[PDB]
């Protein structure tokens, strides 16, 4: 019922990013916590990707995974800087390349069977964009949403993947939205838990990692926790799967938990953004308490501007607004009339 939806905008619908986000929420896409958007055929953010071999990945991370029975922890070892060419050569070498497979279910099995072995290298969190400066549609480098009121939380990031590189279970910083475009290469597969069931995932994680839970009120934000779909099935956490191919966007929604992995050599671009609906999520976000360095946004400017009637109430710790995860963002009103 809160399944992942896929959308196919026309060029005319595609041009206005925020308006289209409001549209898909009016269709209920936010309930799954994750949605796919396939852009029009004619649209490309870049003419060619042949000129980026010399691009530098300053801090590649080797992903060491420890665990068993569908529960794992992922550790980052920073490696020496390398170029995209060097990273590609490693990614496609026999040691690291994608194994043979027919259906996705086979590759998924191989992933969950082999994720503690032969730890791969992920060129993640690279500042940059691969959009040509003139592309005005869904330009992840400059989406100009109300998040701009805040390198940063609204600046673009590149992810150079190879087979079996992973992203762990998490919501975004300050439970923001996120946008992910797969520029090229092999697919990226996603898992998602509906926001309305998010705390059931937290409760389970808390039960399996009580030490981590004791040391931090939001340890999932460390992005170290991997949990297999079989474990989610066993413990009755609802979830959905989707595979993202080259040329496709993924949107994650506030408090939408997601995780996944790359199929082989690929490149993705991502940033965070906001709608008016996010503001309440941002006020109520449970943040990492154990590291000084984590991302924290002052919500004052947002409450003053878009919730002036509640500002003094909120600042006195008495705003008891309860979030209804099923409600679309106010901007979606025009599609419901």
Ligand X SMILES: CCN(/C=C/N(C)C)C(=O)CNCc1cc(C(=O)O)ccn1
Residue 168 touches Zn ion, criterion: CB under 5 A: no
Nearer to ligand X, 88 or 188 (CB): 188
Q: Is 30 a catalytic residue?
A: no
Q: How many residues does the chain have?
A: 337
Q: For strand 5-7 and strand 34-37, is the pairing parallel, antiparallel, or unpaired? A: parallel
User: Does the annotation list 222 as a binding residue?
Assistant: yes
Strand, helix or coil for residue 8: coil
Tokens of 197: 């069931």
Query: Active site includes 141?
Result: no
Region 4-63 residues binding Ni ion, contact defined as CB under 5 A: 49
Set 23, 33, 161, 172: catalytic member: 172
Site string for Zn ion, 201-220 (x = CB under 5 A): ---------------x----
Asked if 32 and 240 count as a contact pair (C-beta separation under 8 A), the reply is yes
Residue 211 binds which entry of Zn ion, Ni ion, ligand X, none, with Cβ cut-offs from 5 to 8 Å by kind?
Ni ion
The catalytic position among 20, 23, 131, 159 is 159
CB neighbours (10 Å) of residue 151?
8
Does the active-site annotation cover 159?
yes
Q: Is 290 annotated as a binding residue?
A: yes
Does 211 engage in binding with Ni ion (CB under 5 A)? yes
Residue-by-residue DSSP string for 171-217: PPGGG-EEEEEEEEES-EEEEEE-GGGHHHHHHHHHHH-HHHHHH-T
Give least dist CB 297 to Ni ion, A: 29
The interface partner of residue 159, options being Zn ion, Ni ion, ligand X, none and the CB cut-off 5 to 8 Å by kind, is ligand X
Question: Among Ni ion, ligand X, Zn ion, none, what does residue 49 contact (CB within 5–8 Å per kind)?
Answer: Ni ion
- Cα separation of 211 and 209, whole Å? 6
Catalytic residue (choose from 270, 280, 282, 325): 270
> Is position 202 annotated as part of the catalytic site?
no
> What's the Cα-to-Cα distance from 186 to each of 154, 247, 263, rounded to whole Å?
26, 11, 6
Residues 175/30, Cβ–Cβ less than 8 Å: no
Residue nearest Ni ion, CB atom distance: 211
Which residue, 179 or 307, has its beta carbon nearer to ligand X?
Answer: 179
- Which one of 96, 161, 191, 258 is the catalytic residue? 258
**Positions of E strands within the chain:** 5-7, 34-37, 56-57, 61-68, 71-78, 82-83, 121-127, 157-161, 166-170, 177-185, 188-193, 225-227, 240-244, 249-252, 257-262, 266-273
* Residue 134 annotated as lining a ligand binding site: no
Number of helical (H) and strand (E) elements in the chain, helices listed first: 10, 16
Catalytic status, residue 289: no
Q: Which does 125 bind (CB under 5 to 8 A by kind): Zn ion, Ni ion, ligand X, none?
A: ligand X
The item of Zn ion, ligand X, Ni ion, none sharing an interface with residue 216, based on CB under 5 to 8 Å by kind, is Zn ion
- Yes or no: say if 257 and 286 are a contact pair by the CB < 8 Å rule: no
Give the footprint of ligand X on this chain (CB under 6 A).
124-125, 157, 159, 167, 172, 178, 180, 188, 268, 270-272
Give the 3-state secondary structure of residue 269: strand
- Was 105 annotated as part of a binding site? no
189 is annotated as an active-site residue: no
Q: Which of residues 130-169 bind Ni ion (CB under 5 A)?
A: none
From the candidates 8, 69, 152, 215, give the one annotated as an active-site residue: 152
How many chain residues touch Ni ion (CB under 5 A)? 6
Of positions 3, 15, 46, 79, contacts Ni ion by CB under 5 A: 79
Closest CA to 137 of 46, 28, 49: 46
Task: Supply the residues annotated as catalytic.
Answer: 152, 159, 170, 172, 258, 270
User: Residues annotated as binding site for Fe cation?
Assistant: 170, 172, 258
């Amino acid at each position: 019922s809160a399944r992942i939806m896929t959308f196919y905008p026309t060029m005319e619908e595609f041009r206005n990013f925020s308006r289209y986000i409001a549209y898909i929420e009016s269709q209920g896409a936010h309930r799954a916590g994750l949605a796919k958007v396939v852009p029009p055929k004619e649209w490309k953010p870049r003419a060619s990707y042949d000129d980026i071999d010399d691009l530098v990945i300053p801090a590649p991370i080797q992903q060491l995974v420890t665990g068993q029975s569908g529960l794992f922890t992922q550790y980052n070892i920073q490696k020496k800087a390398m170029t995209v060419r060097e990273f590609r050569k490693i990614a496609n070498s026999d040691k690291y390349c994608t194994p043979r497979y027919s259906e996705f279910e086979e590759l998924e099995r191989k992933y969950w069977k082999n994720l503690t072995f032969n730890p791969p290298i992920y060129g993640a969190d690279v500042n940059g964009t691969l959009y040509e400066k003139h592309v005005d549609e869904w330009n992840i480098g400059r989406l100009r949403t109300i998040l701009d009121l805040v390198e940063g939380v609204n600046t673009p990031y590149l992810y150079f993947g190879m087979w079996k590189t992973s992203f762990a279970w998490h919501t975004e910083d300050m439970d923001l939205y996120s946008i992910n475009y797969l520029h090229f290469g092999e697919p990226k597969s996603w898992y998602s838990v509906p926001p309305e069931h998010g705390k059931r995932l937290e409760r389970l994680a808390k039960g399996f990692f009580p030490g981590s839970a004791q040391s931090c009120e939001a340890f999932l934000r460390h992005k170290m926790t991997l949990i297999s779909p079989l474990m989610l099935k066993k413990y009755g956490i609802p979830f959905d799967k989707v595979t993202q191919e080259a040329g496709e966007f993924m949107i994650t929604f506030p408090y939408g938990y997601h995780a996944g992995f790359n199929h082989g050599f690929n490149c993705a671009e991502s940033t965070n953004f906001a709608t008016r609906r996010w503001i309440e999520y941002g006020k109520q976000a449970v943040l990492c308490s154990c590291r000084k360095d984590m991302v924290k946004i002052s919500m004052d400017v947002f409450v003053r501007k878009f919730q002036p009637e509640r500002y003094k109430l909120w600042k006195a710790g008495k705003d008891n607004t309860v979030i209804d995860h099923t409600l679309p963002t106010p901007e979606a009103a025009e599609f419901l009339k």
